[PDB]
Design a protein around this ligand. Sequence first.
Ligand SMILES: *Cc1c(COP(=O)(O)O)cnc(C)c1O
Ligand SMILES: *Cc1c(COP(=O)(O)O)cnc(C)c1O
Ligand SMILES: [K+]
Ligand SMILES: [K+]
Lengths: 381, 381
Amino acid sequence: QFPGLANKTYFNFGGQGILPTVALEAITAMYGYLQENGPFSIAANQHIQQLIAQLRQALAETFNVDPNTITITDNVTTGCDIVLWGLDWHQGDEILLTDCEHPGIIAIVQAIAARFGITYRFFPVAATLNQGDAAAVLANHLGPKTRLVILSHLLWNTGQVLPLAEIMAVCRRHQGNYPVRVLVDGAQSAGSLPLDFSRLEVDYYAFTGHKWFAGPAGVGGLYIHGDCLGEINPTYVGWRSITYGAKGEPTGWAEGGKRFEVATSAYPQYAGLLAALQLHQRQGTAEERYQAICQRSEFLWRGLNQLPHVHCLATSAPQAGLVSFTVDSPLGHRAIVQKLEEQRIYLRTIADPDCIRACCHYITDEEEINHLLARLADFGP
Amino acid sequence: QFPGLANKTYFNFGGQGILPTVALEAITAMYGYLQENGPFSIAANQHIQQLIAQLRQALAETFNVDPNTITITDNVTTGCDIVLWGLDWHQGDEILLTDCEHPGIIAIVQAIAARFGITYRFFPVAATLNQGDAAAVLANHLGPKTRLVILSHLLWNTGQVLPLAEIMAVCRRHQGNYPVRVLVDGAQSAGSLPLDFSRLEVDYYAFTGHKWFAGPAGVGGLYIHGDCLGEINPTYVGWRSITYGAKGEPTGWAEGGKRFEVATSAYPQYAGLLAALQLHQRQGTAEERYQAICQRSEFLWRGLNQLPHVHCLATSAPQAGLVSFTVDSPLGHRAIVQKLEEQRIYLRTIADPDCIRACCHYITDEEEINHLLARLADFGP
Ligand SMILES: *Cc1c(COP(=O)(O)O)cnc(C)c1O
Ligand SMILES: *Cc1c(COP(=O)(O)O)cnc(C)c1O
Ligand SMILES: [K+]
Ligand SMILES: [K+]
């Protein structure tokens, strides 16, 4: 089902997932349906709306929530933009971010700091990979003017799974000027960690379909708890954001998460993500998949611990699919990732901390891991 | 080149254009390249950057401007959102829009009005299709606090091509608290009218690739004149919006239009738009295609004038590919458009004014028009 795995040794699922055949087929089929019936017509427009509804519903079931809490976007970042720009920011309001957030999210925060006179600071979580408590660290920085905390559930650089429940509790418990809310960047967590927003209390959770869920680049989504929807004012809007009157005039916002959806999107892509989501559900529960992922990452991590010139950032087994490490070599990590790609082995260079990252998915096998280990063994001081 | 045309009588290019074979081949080829070489890898990441540059350059050439003035988006609306959310609004600032604008664009204006305390007022252009002067109407509405004027170069409802150069002169001649700027919604104009932004002076021009350009749904763009770039602050941003520091940290805004590009997008669809753009240039110059479009629209317009129960809104030949008309019948335009679709004849119901719209492209032929005419003859009072 994942053709792309053959003839390469892929560990970059956290960059982009390998697109399954069923997903490509659905994308191709959707273009065919539009050619045959439209592309712009009563039949085609209806089919597109039915497809959007099917995808919204599939995402809702994925996280065990009502479809009205799901917004379809193009990527992780957009979800973050929706939440951040939607909040009614007042000068001096404060935003706390872990020191392991994505450059693009930081950039939104900076744009918002400059726009509403808000402030932001980082709390050190990187250092808690092997010790400490990121929740305790957060508390330590929580203030009276803190309004929003931004954190990645699974860190893209170190592979740490942040203690989300305790960080939420720490946040509820807090008594300040604002009820502290938490925007979660789920780029790495969604599709790898089992996520249930019924059993797990979340405020905002942005994710994408193109990484661990293995859908095509260009389709992602955003979860907003019903109790937080009101606080989020639509910002980028368009014809998909509203309801219409008798003369075709705007008459209010569309139902639930639809108000944050803009206008024409690559619909066939939606069918691709739908197919990819349905495939993963065909392969055991989220929990069984997560355990499969950890068994692969621990096997790789254990393998790396045995190589004399490789040093894993994690001193205990990885809590998810991300395994970061450094290599003792004059070459530098970029040259090593490049040479590895020369041999059709795909890993990623991490900018901070300066290291290399490997992603193991439930479709990764030991043979691919042993291959990586054999070629990594070639580097040294 | 446009397989979708056979076996239907399509007049809905203004809704979505028929996708040419070369575009579907480029889309498919891009998924294949990602499968073979990535999808996330040095080779794949470079191939995508090269693709984005090629598309940005082809758009730049289409409008005869420098690539730095072009932002790639997913649709017309996003271009309007970028400009509107980026201007430094102050309470009391006023926006004028024609009474023929898209409901989605009015929705952004109301959100801005609500967020920055600006005000908006409509000016009547719909009634200027056959008489009067849209620029003069705008002159009679310009005020002391007028900062921006929003208008569609080609009206999606009546098919009128507004006198843009004259409107620009009017705005530039006006003396008030602000240099009056103009945001053009080019959803119908781009890809049908020949547009040269070095000959035609323009401030902000939003467009999409999925209508007259015949690209796939999900890719569009925005033009911003070099002297206005400084006035548009980035709003929705992400990793594609910035320049980077030695440690992977954000250090500024990316060059030119890139500052308004966010994050992961439907890259194979970009190759699709690129191939469609190239196909049109191979058919003839923008001017030749425009003349062919008008030849078709006038032939259609003429035929409709001969039918006793059909009444074209335009009393002189259409200035572009859009031909709107009403039908004297107890059925109602929506029911008529549905009956036509049942016969695989594709038109669009217009909410205001209450009419039907047909779109003729350079690929439309006489047999299709005559067949449409044949079927409309059946409706009567
Ligand atoms: C991939 C990634 C993003 C960016 O994702 P897009 O889908 O391109 O927005 C954001 N954050 C983290 C932590 C990532 O790993
Ligand atoms: C079609 C259309 C739009 C909407 O285009 P999207 O690409 O879906 O944003 C906006 N304005 C006019 C005048 C249109 O005809
Ligand atoms: K080791
Ligand atoms: K007539």
